Structure 1
Amino acid sequence: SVPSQKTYQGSYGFRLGFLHSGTAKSVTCTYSPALNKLFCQLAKTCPVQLWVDSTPPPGTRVRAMAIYKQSQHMTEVVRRCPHHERCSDSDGLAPPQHLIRVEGNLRAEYLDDRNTFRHSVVVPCEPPEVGSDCTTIHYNYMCYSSCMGGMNRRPILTIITLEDSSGNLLGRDSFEVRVCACPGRDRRTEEENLRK
């Protein structure tokens, strides 16, 4: 009743990568390697790189799912709060309850698991554009970490899985996420707290 978060490169050497966006007050998405934590504003583009050592088979897919980080909340489905699930912000593909969306990919599919009720969004693997060495998926997080009746200040993890055409596991990586108004300030604060 809890998805695994164990990092697993698998046969294709799968792992994530993040840009270096800095901590200026204006930054909208910034990743802390020291915390393995992405800080982002509500509904803003979060570029996540996908890296492999070798090409996975045709029909391989990449799925994203959120879980609560704290063990005492891990069995609770992460969903949008009672306010945001009712706001008129649909993109025509993502169900209004889903926290994580993929931006700019008409082949994205959204799953409400019939057994666990967890939400996820999955896209087909596509090779990098000519001249690039990795593929980037653009995610959006559709609720603040602080939203009452939803995440309610509880930290979450995003689990990214590489899957075969039947959904079997080929690779896994993960990162913590805080969705907040000032990601640059919050990253600096939490990195300072860690250094102390």
Structure 2
Amino acid sequence: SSSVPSQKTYQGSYGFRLGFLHSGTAKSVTCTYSPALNKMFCQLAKTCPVQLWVDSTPPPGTRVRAMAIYKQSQHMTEVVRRCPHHERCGLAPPQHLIRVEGNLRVEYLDDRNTFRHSVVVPYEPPEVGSDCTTIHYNYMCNSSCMGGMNRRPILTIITLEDSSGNLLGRNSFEVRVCACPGRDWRTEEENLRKKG
């Protein structure tokens, strides 16, 4: 069986979608999202809020899993890991790229067969008056980190799963972790218009 997780969007019977809060497009804004590229630009070790939207209520015990995969075909089969420097320098294993902050029920998985890392939290329905649920993700390396992502773009795959392990929904977005998300967002959108 494949050790490469699926990245194909599957909004599913609950109408599962992701949302992202708009930002101020300063050169070094901490986080900004491009709808045109379906791509988050963010800084390392700083909060990246991701909204979960659903049309129907998931059952009790639903979980939310995040997992990184390399976007380029030639790197898809390599597990995405923290670089040795940031690994060397209290729940998250130091090898995990993606953390969740602000949740008391976070679980970190090292898959015993595929060796892939993932981080899971319970799904919580949005509070009254609110239309979505926000998870605070953290990426612990830059996309450029030598010995880690090494300038290779990744996708974050967000899966909605029931307690039995059924896939309820899947979405993904590209990520560039970088020093200057505003500059790099502008550059990539201009490149899309001029050369895409």
Q: TM-score, normalised by structure 2?
A: 0.96
4+ residue runs over 6 A deviation: none
Q: Could you tell me how far 1:25 is from its partner in structure 2?
A: 1.8
Measure, in 1, the Cα distance between the counterparts of 2:135 and 2:170.
15
SS at match of 1:191: helix
Deviation, 1:131, is 2.0
Deviation at 1:46, TM superposition (A): 0.4
**1-structure distance, mates of 2:122, 2:166:** 14
- Indicate if the aligned counterparts of 2:16 and 2:169 stay in contact, CA closer than 8 A: yes
Describe the superposition over 1:49-95 as per-residue Cα deviations: whole angstroms up to 9, x where unpaired: 000001010001110000000011111000000101111xxxx1111
Distance 1:155 1:11 in 2: 30
5+ residue gaps in structure 1? none
Identify the residue that residue 166 of structure 2 maps to in structure 1: 168
Unaligned runs of 5+ in 2: none
Residue of structure 2 aligned with 1:38, choices 37, 40, 46: 40
1:23 shift after superposition: 1.5
Of residues 8, 11, 15 in structure 2, which corresponds to 1:9? 11
Q: Distance in 2 between matches of 1:169 and 1:127?
A: 18
In 2, distance between residues paired with 1:166 and 1:144? 34
Q: How far apart, in 1, do the equivalents of 2:166 and 2:111 lie?
A: 15
Equivalent position SS for 2:165:
coil
- C-alpha distance in 2, partners of 1:113/1:155? 22
Q: Distance in 1 between matches of 2:164 and 2:98?
A: 22
Counterparts of 1:48 and 1:105 in 2: how far apart (Å)?
A: 14
Post-superposition offset of 1:128: 1.2
Q: Tell me the secondary structure at the aligned position of residue 60 of structure 2.
A: coil
> Residues 19-58 of structure 1, C-alpha deviation per residue, up to 9 Å, x if partnerless?
1113112410000001110000011110100000010100
1:167 deviates by 2.0
Contact 2:28/2:183 (CA < 8 Å) preserved in 1? no
| Residue 176 of structure 2: aligned partner | 178
- Post-superposition Cα deviations, 1:129-184, rounded to whole Å, max 9, x if no partner, equal 22211100000000011110110000100000000102221100000000000000
SS in 2 for 1:10: coil
Cα deviation digits, residues 86-143 of structure 1 (max 9, x gap): 11xxxx1111100000011010100000100000000101111222111000000000
For residue 193 of structure 1, give the secondary structure of its aligned residue in structure 2.
helix
2:26 pairs, out of 8, 24, 27, with 24
- Residues 28 and 179, structure 2, Cα contact 8 Å, conserved in 1: no
Percent identical residues: 97
**Helix, strand or coil for the counterpart of 1:83?**
helix
Match for 1:153 among 141, 151, 154? Answer: 151
Report the count of equivalent residues: 191
